[PDB]
Design an enzyme around this catalytic site. Structure first.
Site, PDB file in Angstrom:
ATOM      1  N   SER A 110       4.488   3.714   7.581  1.00 17.02           N
ATOM      2  CA  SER A 110       3.948   2.743   6.643  1.00 17.02           C
ATOM      3  C   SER A 110       5.092   1.961   6.013  1.00 17.02           C
ATOM      4  O   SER A 110       6.060   2.540   5.506  1.00 17.02           O
ATOM      5  CB  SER A 110       3.118   3.437   5.556  1.00 17.02           C
ATOM      6  OG  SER A 110       1.730   3.491   5.895  1.00 17.02           O
ATOM      7  N   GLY A 111       4.985   0.637   6.053  1.00 12.33           N
ATOM      8  CA  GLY A 111       6.001  -0.196   5.470  1.00 12.33           C
ATOM      9  C   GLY A 111       7.175  -0.437   6.379  1.00 12.33           C
ATOM     10  O   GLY A 111       8.115  -1.119   5.968  1.00 12.33           O
ATOM     11  N   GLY A 143       6.032   3.945  13.905  1.00 11.00           N
ATOM     12  CA  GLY A 143       6.391   3.225  12.697  1.00 11.00           C
ATOM     13  C   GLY A 143       5.825   3.913  11.465  1.00 11.00           C
ATOM     14  O   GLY A 143       4.687   4.384  11.456  1.00 11.00           O
ATOM     15  N   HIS A 185       0.811  -1.214   0.000  1.00 11.66           N
ATOM     16  CA  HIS A 185       0.000   0.000   0.000  1.00 11.66           C
ATOM     17  C   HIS A 185       0.843   1.262   0.000  1.00 11.66           C
ATOM     18  O   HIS A 185       0.285   2.351  -0.187  1.00 11.66           O
ATOM     19  CB  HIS A 185      -0.947   0.019   1.205  1.00 11.66           C
ATOM     20  CG  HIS A 185      -0.333   0.573   2.453  1.00 11.66           C
ATOM     21  ND1 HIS A 185       0.125  -0.229   3.475  1.00 11.66           N
ATOM     22  CD2 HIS A 185      -0.102   1.849   2.844  1.00 11.66           C
ATOM     23  CE1 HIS A 185       0.606   0.528   4.446  1.00 11.66           C
ATOM     24  NE2 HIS A 185       0.484   1.793   4.088  1.00 11.66           N
ATOM     25  N   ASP A 221      -0.048  -7.312   2.536  1.00 12.89           N
ATOM     26  CA  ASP A 221       0.478  -5.973   2.274  1.00 12.89           C
ATOM     27  C   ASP A 221       2.009  -5.992   2.299  1.00 12.89           C
ATOM     28  O   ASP A 221       2.656  -5.493   3.226  1.00 12.89           O
ATOM     29  CB  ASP A 221      -0.093  -5.001   3.297  1.00 12.89           C
ATOM     30  CG  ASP A 221       0.237  -3.565   2.990  1.00 12.89           C
ATOM     31  OD1 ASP A 221       0.736  -3.275   1.883  1.00 12.89           O
ATOM     32  OD2 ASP A 221      -0.010  -2.716   3.867  1.00 12.89           O
TER      33      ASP A 221
END
Lengths: 241, 241
Positions: free
Chosen positions: B191-192, B189, B57, B102
């Site tokens: 994303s990813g 954190g 995403h 994801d």
């Protein structure tokens, strides 16, 4: 376009809570998107007999199917058209992280047969102005995700984006538009479903459902792809294909 | 892998609110993903010198850049490596609507130079069991999105998925894992970005940041791609490319 053969009926109850049942067939551009297994996962809006516009974060592929002319997803006996998707056109400016430019066009393998219950919504022109506080309608089976199974509808006001970011902050981008937070939820719209406003006697597609209040809050507006910012891309796609 | 040359220091403050500053260089697999313009938008984790694993995403493309060896995104003067991405591998089971599966792998044009501050996290094996209530660490610049600019860290417990869906309901899928809601947010954190647990003296990548509490609530767990459900896909990708 934009003029249902069966005219919608919107009471006050469409303005509070989760809106209300729509008159059967009264939103004839509303379609259901079902994957290979028959599972309804998104909405979209017919814009002519060969094309459906929906959201890109829906991730429609050609194994999915456009279901037109539906009202009661629990019924077994309404004249509906299951239409194969020949080709999917994701707006290449789609930012899957922000979900900005959240639009995708589906081109049908065979044309839909328009009828009393199946026909096109009007698209706005790039320059149209749908003012903040305009009452508009979202429709869909969104409350299916937990419960009714007939098409719901809700009347909810538009917000300016300056005003929408007091709820979503920097998430609200330029090609986005918000609506609701007036004591009525926006969860009845499916992902990829329509947000229409009645301009010049004709319902016009102003938004595509992008995301909603995590809790279906009646005081949190829903977020839509702003169709005016993307109708040029829509037309050029149709022109080239 | 998994054994930083500079060992992390985690106090109690990592267990409440938004965690705390990490020791510089102490999470050497943490990378920053910056688009063509230098803008930091996602995180990821080096798994060897040629590969970075991140979230799908995130929508990484090859115009984006992997930034390694960073600590202070405001600094101008730390030895970092900006590494070009040769090819992006999105896990084809990625469901952009549910955000299940994801995961995406980035293969670097040129190898990263491992060092004290740049090295690989261990990947779990498909069958590993990271029990509910295990303390684990998420790290990233997530609080950048509004504010600190140095790498943050937070210790937060894992949840079973049965237990995680009391917060997210049917959104929580099989290839997902949750952590937090113990009085400490998970928004640090990116994303990813990584979620690591210390198995056998070696930090192991257990989750990739998928989505968090809309309000950074300290009583709502974050949602991660469950790396055990996807490490086979990771290895087969590396084997074929």
């Amino acid at each position: 376009c934009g003029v249902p053969a069966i005219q919608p009926v919107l009471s006050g109850l469409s303005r509070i809570v989760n809106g209300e049942e729509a008159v059967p067939g009264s939103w004839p551009w509303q379609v259901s998107l079902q994957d290979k297994t028959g599972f309804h996962f998104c909405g979209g809006s017919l814009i002519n007999e060969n094309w459906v516009v929906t959201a890109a974060h829906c991730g429609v592929t050609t194994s999915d199917v456009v279901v037109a002319g539906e009202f009661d997803q629990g019924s077994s006996s309404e004249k509906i058209q299951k239409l194969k998707i020949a080709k999917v056109f994701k707006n290449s400016k789609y930012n899957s992280l922000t979900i900005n430019n959240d639009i995708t066009l589906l081109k049908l393998s065979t044309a839909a047969s328009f009828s009393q219950t199946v026909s096109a919504v009007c698209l706005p022109s790039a320059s149209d102005d749908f003012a903040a506080g305009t009452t508009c309608v979202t429709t869909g089976w969104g409350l299916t995700r937990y419960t009714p199974d007939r098409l719901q509808q809700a009347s909810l006001p538009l917000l300016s984006n300056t005003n929408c970011k007091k709820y979503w902050g920097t998430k609200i981008k330029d090609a986005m538009i918000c609506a609701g937070a007036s004591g009525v939820s926006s969860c009845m719209g499916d992902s990829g479903g329509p947000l229409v406003c009645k301009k010049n006697g004709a319902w016009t597609l102003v938004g595509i459902v992008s995301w909603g209040s995590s809790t279906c809050s009646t005081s949190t507006p829903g977020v839509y792809a702003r169709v005016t910012a993307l109708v040029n891309w829509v037309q050029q796609t149709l022109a080239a294909n």
